[PDB]
Write a protein that binds this ligand. Structure first.
Ligand SMILES: CC(C)(C)C[C@@H]1N[C@@H](C(=O)NCCN)[C@H](c2cccc(Cl)c2F)[C@]12C(=O)Nc1cc(Cl)ccc12
Length: 89
């Protein structure tokens, strides 16, 4: 059910993820996970990979996550895919 505390986690995205974030406006070295989820979420809507599965097999999101798609309901899984592209602060 995940803890609310997780969204407060401070993180430094690796180069590729930092590249995705910068496309929806991000301009920081370090982010809170809340910011990361919001910016990735706008990356997903503005680019219609979602309308409850997200389709990214032909996008760098797909490259960063290592999957051609994923269910937006699987939060623990999404969290694990995101941490592979960042370092905690
Ligand atoms: C464009 C969108 C797909 C509708 C946005 C997404 N909506 C959220 C959700 O759970 N919707 C169910 C309805 N309650 C989802 C989400 C929110 C908070 C934590 C997690 Cl792990 C999460 F998955 C969301 C998000 O906010 N950011 C985000 C980032 C990635 Cl990489 C995948 C999915 C998301």
């Amino acid at each position: 059910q995940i803890p609310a505390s997780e969204q407060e986690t401070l993180v430094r995205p690796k180069p590729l993820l930092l590249k995705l974030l910068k496309s929806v406006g991000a301009q920081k070295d370090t982010y809170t996970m809340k910011e990361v989820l919001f910016y990735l979420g706008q990356y997903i809507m503005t680019k219609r990979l979602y309308d409850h599965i997200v389709y990214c097999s032909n996008d760098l999101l797909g490259d960063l996550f290592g999957v051609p798609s994923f269910s937006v309901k699987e939060h623990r899984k999404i969290y694990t895919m995101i941490y592979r592209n960042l370092v905690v602060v």
